[PDB]
Amino acid sequence: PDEAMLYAPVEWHDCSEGFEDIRYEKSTDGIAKITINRPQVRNAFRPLTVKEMIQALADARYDDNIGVIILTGAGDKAFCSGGDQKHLNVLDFQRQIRTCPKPVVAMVAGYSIGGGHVLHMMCDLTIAADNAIFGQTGPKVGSFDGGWGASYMARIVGQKKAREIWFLCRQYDAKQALDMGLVNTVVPLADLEKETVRWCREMLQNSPMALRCLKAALNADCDGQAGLQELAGNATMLFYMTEEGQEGRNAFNQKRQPDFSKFKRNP
Amino acid sequence: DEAMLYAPVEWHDCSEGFEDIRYEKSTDGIAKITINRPQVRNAFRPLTVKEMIQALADARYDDNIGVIILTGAGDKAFCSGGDVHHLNVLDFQRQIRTCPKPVVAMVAGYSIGGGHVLHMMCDLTIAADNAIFGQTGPKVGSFDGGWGASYMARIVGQKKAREIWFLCRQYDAKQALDMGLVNTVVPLADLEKETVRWCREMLQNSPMALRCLKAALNADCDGQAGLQELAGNATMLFYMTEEGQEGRNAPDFSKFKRNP
Amino acid sequence: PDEAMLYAPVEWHDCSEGFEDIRYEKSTDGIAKITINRPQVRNAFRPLTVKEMIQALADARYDDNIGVIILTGAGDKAFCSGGDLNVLDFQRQIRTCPKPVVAMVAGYSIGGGHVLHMMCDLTIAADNAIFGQTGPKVGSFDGGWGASYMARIVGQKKAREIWFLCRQYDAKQALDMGLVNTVVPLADLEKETVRWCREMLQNSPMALRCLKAALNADCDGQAGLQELAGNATMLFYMTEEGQEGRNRQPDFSKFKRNP
Amino acid sequence: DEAMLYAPVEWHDCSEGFEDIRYEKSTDGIAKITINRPQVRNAFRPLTVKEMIQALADARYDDNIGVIILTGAGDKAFCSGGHHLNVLDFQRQIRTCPKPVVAMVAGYSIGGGHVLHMMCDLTIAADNAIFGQTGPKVGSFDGGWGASYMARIVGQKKAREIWFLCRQYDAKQALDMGLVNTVVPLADLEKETVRWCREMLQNSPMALRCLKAALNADCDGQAGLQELAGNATMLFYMTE
Amino acid sequence: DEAMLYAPVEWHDCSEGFEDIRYEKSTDGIAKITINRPQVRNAFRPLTVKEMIQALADARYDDNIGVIILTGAGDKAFCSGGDQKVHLNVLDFQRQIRTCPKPVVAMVAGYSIGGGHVLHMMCDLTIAADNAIFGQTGPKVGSFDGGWGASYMARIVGQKKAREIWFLCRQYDAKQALDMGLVNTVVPLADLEKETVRWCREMLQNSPMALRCLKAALNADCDGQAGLQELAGNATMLFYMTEEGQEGRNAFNQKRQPDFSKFKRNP
Amino acid sequence: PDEAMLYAPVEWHDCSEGFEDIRYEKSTDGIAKITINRPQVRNAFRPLTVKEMIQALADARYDDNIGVIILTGAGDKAFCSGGDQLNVLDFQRQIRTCPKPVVAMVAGYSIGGGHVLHMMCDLTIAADNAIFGQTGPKVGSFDGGWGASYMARIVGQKKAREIWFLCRQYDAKQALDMGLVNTVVPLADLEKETVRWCREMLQNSPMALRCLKAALNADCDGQAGLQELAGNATMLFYMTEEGQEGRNAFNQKRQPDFSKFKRNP
Numbered sequence A: 001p002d003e004a005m006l007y008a009p010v011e012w013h014d015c016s017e018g019f020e021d022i023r024y025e026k027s028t029d030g031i032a033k034i035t036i037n038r039p040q041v042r043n044a045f046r047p048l049t050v051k052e053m054i055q056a057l058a059d060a061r062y063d064d065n066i067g068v069i070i071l072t073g074a075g076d077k078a079f080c081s082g083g084d085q086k087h088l089n090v091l092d093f094q095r096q097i098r099t100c101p102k103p104v105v106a107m108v109a110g111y112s113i114g115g116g117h118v119l120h121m122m123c124d125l126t127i128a129a130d131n132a133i134f135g136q137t138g139p140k141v142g143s144f145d146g147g148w149g150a151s152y153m154a155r156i157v158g159q160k161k162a163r164e165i166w167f168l169c170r171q172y173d174a175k176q177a178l179d180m181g182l183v184n185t186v187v188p189l190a191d192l193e194k195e196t197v198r199w200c201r202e203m204l205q206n207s208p209m210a211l212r213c214l215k216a217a218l219n220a221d222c223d224g225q226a227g228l229q230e231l232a233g234n235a236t237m238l239f240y241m242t243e244e245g246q247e248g249r250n251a252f253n254q255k256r257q258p259d260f261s262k263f264k265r266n267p
Numbered sequence B: 001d002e003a004m005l006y007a008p009v010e011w012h013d014c015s016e017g018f019e020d021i022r023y024e025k026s027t028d029g030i031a032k033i034t035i036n037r038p039q040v041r042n043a044f045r046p047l048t049v050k051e052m053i054q055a056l057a058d059a060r061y062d063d064n065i066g067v068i069i070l071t072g073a074g075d076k077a078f079c080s081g082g083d084v085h086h087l088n089v090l091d092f093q094r095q096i097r098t099c100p101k102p103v104v105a106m107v108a109g110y111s112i113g114g115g116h117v118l119h120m121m122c123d124l125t126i127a128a129d130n131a132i133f134g135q136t137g138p139k140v141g142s143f144d145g146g147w148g149a150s151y152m153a154r155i156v157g158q159k160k161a162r163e164i165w166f167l168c169r170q171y172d173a174k175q176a177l178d179m180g181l182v183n184t185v186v187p188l189a190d191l192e193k194e195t196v197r198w199c200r201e202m203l204q205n206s207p208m209a210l211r212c213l214k215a216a217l218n219a220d221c222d223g224q225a226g227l228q229e230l231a232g233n234a235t236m237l238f239y240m241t242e243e244g245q246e247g248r249n250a251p252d253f254s255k256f257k258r259n260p
Numbered sequence C: 001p002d003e004a005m006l007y008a009p010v011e012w013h014d015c016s017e018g019f020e021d022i023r024y025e026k027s028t029d030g031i032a033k034i035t036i037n038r039p040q041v042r043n044a045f046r047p048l049t050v051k052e053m054i055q056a057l058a059d060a061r062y063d064d065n066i067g068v069i070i071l072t073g074a075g076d077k078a079f080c081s082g083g084d085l086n087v088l089d090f091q092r093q094i095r096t097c098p099k100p101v102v103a104m105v106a107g108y109s110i111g112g113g114h115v116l117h118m119m120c121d122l123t124i125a126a127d128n129a130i131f132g133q134t135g136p137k138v139g140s141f142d143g144g145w146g147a148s149y150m151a152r153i154v155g156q157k158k159a160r161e162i163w164f165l166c167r168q169y170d171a172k173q174a175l176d177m178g179l180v181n182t183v184v185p186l187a188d189l190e191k192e193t194v195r196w197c198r199e200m201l202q203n204s205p206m207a208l209r210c211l212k213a214a215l216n217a218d219c220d221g222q223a224g225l226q227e228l229a230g231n232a233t234m235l236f237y238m239t240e241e242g243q244e245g246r247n248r249q250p251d252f253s254k255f256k257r258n259p
Numbered sequence D: 001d002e003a004m005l006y007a008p009v010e011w012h013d014c015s016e017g018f019e020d021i022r023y024e025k026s027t028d029g030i031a032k033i034t035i036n037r038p039q040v041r042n043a044f045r046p047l048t049v050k051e052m053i054q055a056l057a058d059a060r061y062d063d064n065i066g067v068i069i070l071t072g073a074g075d076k077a078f079c080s081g082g083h084h085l086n087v088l089d090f091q092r093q094i095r096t097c098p099k100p101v102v103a104m105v106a107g108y109s110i111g112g113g114h115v116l117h118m119m120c121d122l123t124i125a126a127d128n129a130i131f132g133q134t135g136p137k138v139g140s141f142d143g144g145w146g147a148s149y150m151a152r153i154v155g156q157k158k159a160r161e162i163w164f165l166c167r168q169y170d171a172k173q174a175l176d177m178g179l180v181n182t183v184v185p186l187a188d189l190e191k192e193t194v195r196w197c198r199e200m201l202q203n204s205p206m207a208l209r210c211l212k213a214a215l216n217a218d219c220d221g222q223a224g225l226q227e228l229a230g231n232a233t234m235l236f237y238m239t240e
Numbered sequence E: 001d002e003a004m005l006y007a008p009v010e011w012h013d014c015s016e017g018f019e020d021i022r023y024e025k026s027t028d029g030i031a032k033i034t035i036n037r038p039q040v041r042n043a044f045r046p047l048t049v050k051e052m053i054q055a056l057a058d059a060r061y062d063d064n065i066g067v068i069i070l071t072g073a074g075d076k077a078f079c080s081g082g083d084q085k086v087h088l089n090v091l092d093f094q095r096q097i098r099t100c101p102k103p104v105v106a107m108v109a110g111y112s113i114g115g116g117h118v119l120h121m122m123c124d125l126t127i128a129a130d131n132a133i134f135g136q137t138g139p140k141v142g143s144f145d146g147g148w149g150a151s152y153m154a155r156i157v158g159q160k161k162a163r164e165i166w167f168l169c170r171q172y173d174a175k176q177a178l179d180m181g182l183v184n185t186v187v188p189l190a191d192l193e194k195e196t197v198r199w200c201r202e203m204l205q206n207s208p209m210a211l212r213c214l215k216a217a218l219n220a221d222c223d224g225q226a227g228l229q230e231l232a233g234n235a236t237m238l239f240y241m242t243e244e245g246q247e248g249r250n251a252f253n254q255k256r257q258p259d260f261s262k263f264k265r266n267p
Numbered sequence F: 001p002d003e004a005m006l007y008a009p010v011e012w013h014d015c016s017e018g019f020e021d022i023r024y025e026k027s028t029d030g031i032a033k034i035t036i037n038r039p040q041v042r043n044a045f046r047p048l049t050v051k052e053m054i055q056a057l058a059d060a061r062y063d064d065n066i067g068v069i070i071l072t073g074a075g076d077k078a079f080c081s082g083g084d085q086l087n088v089l090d091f092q093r094q095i096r097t098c099p100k101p102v103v104a105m106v107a108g109y110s111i112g113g114g115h116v117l118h119m120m121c122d123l124t125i126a127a128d129n130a131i132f133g134q135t136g137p138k139v140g141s142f143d144g145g146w147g148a149s150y151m152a153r154i155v156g157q158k159k160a161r162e163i164w165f166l167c168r169q170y171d172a173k174q175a176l177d178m179g180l181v182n183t184v185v186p187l188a189d190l191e192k193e194t195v196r197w198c199r200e201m202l203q204n205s206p207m208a209l210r211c212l213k214a215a216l217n218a219d220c221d222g223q224a225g226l227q228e229l230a231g232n233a234t235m236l237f238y239m240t241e242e243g244q245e246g247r248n249a250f251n252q253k254r255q256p257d258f259s260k261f262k263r264n265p
């Protein structure tokens, strides 16, 4: 749509009540924002942080006013620097982002590293500041994510770069990540939220149903039968919104056997 | 209820212009494709395939047809294999697969070689008690490693799929039933009677549901090609919803719930 | 494992406080039982039933004294007759549960109900159990695990027949098509299920957890990979080379680079 | 060598009976299916699709045709998108076509018109070409090959960007993301496209169909395996 | 004809250098690898795997061999698995049976247990004797096979029975194995090689190229790109036996650039 | 890792004894190097070359002192120009299932069968003179195995079809841009930079690298991939106490007792 709308000021309302490690805000125009708020530790998550993010995300998913989720870190220095070095419920969170019917965007300034780097990849889109830094650390610190951290990363950057990223554990700047297709765009640090909000509003103008259907379709290319469950799940929901889909329910209400003879067969 | 399911069938001939097949439609919406070459045990040649592609294309587009029966003429053979391309039966195989209406193999006598892959491709197989199944390719050198191999495994399992292909034995109806190759076995005389019952049980059901499920069961096998079928049904469904039609007429989408 | 241990009496302890639609019980020896408790309506689930079952399975999961979960219906006439779409979440949750889940089925397992039992790792059926779908009969479908996974159990011909015709199948037909693991007399249903549960409790829970993730991994693509690899990660922490990283730069030279 | 690849093409018309498409053949083996509705920016309607299915079926069955070009009339559009969904049949057809199909794109390749170019084995883009999806903007989606297969071309991050926002992408953006195979100035679109077709025509047509089936088989599961073992069978008739 | 199939078998010893296995060849193309440690019920130690790998490799490359039998010494045990008194190189042996371009038949008498059960599963076919006993033990003894021992079992018996076999670690007799499709046939113990040899001979009647392509094709439903590799390998092989496949080599002989215009372009 | 350590000279020790077509060397710090040594025929392989690469790669796998294998061609003109004028499929699986990272070091030609080999390696380090391509369709052959499907998992399906259907040659820069190689370095520095990448991987956990290698194959190789990935899990399981309990039970005569282990969520 028009830039005037897209770059309009963002109003965030606080819904962080009871959260220790994260902030949770909503805009009136449909965006929910989850902020890892541990900037002293470069926004490393600990098990509490994960549990809170799971709650915030369950909430965003169930809130009809919300159509897009942003995941970010407080400050300019880190998105998320990984698991806290000082059990593995972050897997749950990965699943939860994967199966969330609304687009989830990673708004990344500075460090996205380790468990934190898998977090941004799990998100549908990544918006990077020009100061953003990406990479894995597992093999360097005796650990690994060989699940979506591995196979899904390949589906993003190809198998030669996935092997480089994991095996060597180097760091990559924003341009390097842009070039290998690891992030969707690179924007100046001062404009990060401006542009991220723009991208969200662009999606918000589009069909929520279409967006969830394509999301599941894109997962379905990776997640075998789990993907099929999402994709058919939307198909079922769509069916219930058609007349033939409503006959069974109308039949029961009217105390009669369903009659499918009165419906056209398509080719 | 038996009375309805076992009521007689009114077949109308639709075989106009076909040499190798007969093609019939019933008033209650059953289309039957019959290979009409029992002088060569119902083996197909390219023309036979080309005509089956036509019939099935007709059935697919006919609003009155819900279920297709594929069968052979007579009692001795369903299809004993191959003898307008050398291998167009592959095309016909796909078209059974992506056909949004259930296809049922009505098998009397022999279902061998290419003829055996054909009944397997059908969503269901009703077998007469005189039915015989098996592959032969390996004997003469030929073979089917596509759905002829992989998809057979998703029916009978990997041990028996290797057995059937590697030895190329013949199996009677009882053997086929116990390994899950056919859905049921009936006395030869009642073969059509039971097939029509199965067909009618399907006709009482939601055609849109049948078509989505069939696409879903295919999608466990056909990777991105199965996804195409399944998502295409979703797209189709979408256009019948209010939200889908709102985008067409334009687009204010905020008036539709962002469901969890 | 001798019969005397396996067929010992079972002590259930009620954990049902705050549950309106379900019962939730635990045994001394590590079995968590989730019982759908709406027999007036043949044990159909509404959204409340699903939310409670999710809660109870979440609890069973995080309880270290639980090794097996039994899912069942109250009474002798129905396991679950289907819906009265959050049941998708419950399905996902049964799938990724690191402990064996057992459907214990008496009478009707139908529709959404039938998909629940299939989702469970095993199914012990009473001789009075009935199975089948009803979607196409009532204008709906389950085309996720309800379809693909059914095929990985009974094969594609049977899967197509079950769905397309929506017939009903007795315990005998279900057993013969591989749909259930075993059929026992109605009176012995819990007795025999507890036995299967106890036999699993005698085995390595870490082994069961890996194998389950591994069996899922043959159906669930990268989602199965996430589970399996996640177990590998868990195992890795429990080793010295995995511990070395957390303990100055790390040094892995003191470790074999095996073949 | 450049002189051969760049020689003039001898087109022969085969557009008999077609309202919405042109269909031409060269002596050296190229078939060209042109969408001929430039007024509506080469959008397809059920007839167009029915006619493209016919032409593509012809090309597949002609021993003289080695390569097929799919394109739009004029310099402003390739195809700006759309029984109802017989374009799904045409997708399947492009997929299983045992010969390379090359999308020659000038101007817009949008919506269903975008999926069509993706479905082609190769895409040769003019410098004025524009790409994107529109479904979520216009209450539709292609979550079949339009989704998964897009991922296999551009990666999951770009595929989600393309579908979720439905922006437009210029030729350079398309090239850079692996979406098209090359970009040429508009005046050279067909000249360069024909060269690519002629480089494939110098190669083994059996080798090409086997490789296309193999690349498909990385996506289409048992349907990929069927294409693949179909070729092995056709190979095993060529032996003793 | 039953006269040919049940004719006497002439076995030729080729066990030179082996300590844990016998290795024989018949004059009509069957290779038989026999695990020979019956005092420990044919459990394999690392040396047993090394020798089974050599023997298998030899059978694969011997053009005179069309079919391979895997079996154990005596009537009481096929193979009861890893030796408790004791690298993980049975995975190599597993992979070798998988990619073996010839049919491999597990001839099972008595126990096929743990890793020994996994070996019989990997074999294309299994001929069991009425005394045969099957099952896993991993969870009973703190171990597991999660690769082919899990996933591929599922493709034999289905997900319900696979979960049963692995989770409970019971034993199953011959009738039970037959019923769940775990084995191809059950025969009397006295007749075990009589019958097994018959099956082998029914396979020798057919084309080795055809068998090879079908084995590859059926592996291809399970093994992703690895399967495709076997499948294409055969296709590349078939190709060379054609004119168009020979046209490249004849171009380089005649010192000319290849010409492919003279070949039809089938539909 | 510091630059001084990474760019330290490399001491290679010859291990090529009995090898005709290949050299095989090992450095003290854990790199093995298989060099195709037929520069006269642009380092193309004949059957014996493949037999020796199998042996040498088998050795590197079983040598516990080695953690990374480099694959390369002699001289600066070629890496491998492919088949000469099917056991190379065995060497392919062997690179695939090698629990240690395998790096292709490419100078000059990597072509045909020689091109599939570089793609098969986990990483590819390319010199600025490197040339990549297929030739099969031009000469009436094809690799429709990992040569096709896996190629697409590197460069995308549009480039995969372009590379196969046309059989052109691509310079280093083109190879780098479609993501076919990992980096392009000046020819003079080829081994300097290559050994650097190996050392960085050698500073990391060998157990981590093999799991992650299996996990990434497992996105391609179906149940075969699951066998690699589960095999590593089984292995790690033996290294835990719960896994040792089984065998400990047998050695102490008793029935195993798993009740004393935490049933985690």
Ligand SMILES: [Cl-]
Pocket (backbone or CB within 6 Å): E045, E046, E047
């Ligand atoms: Cl030893």
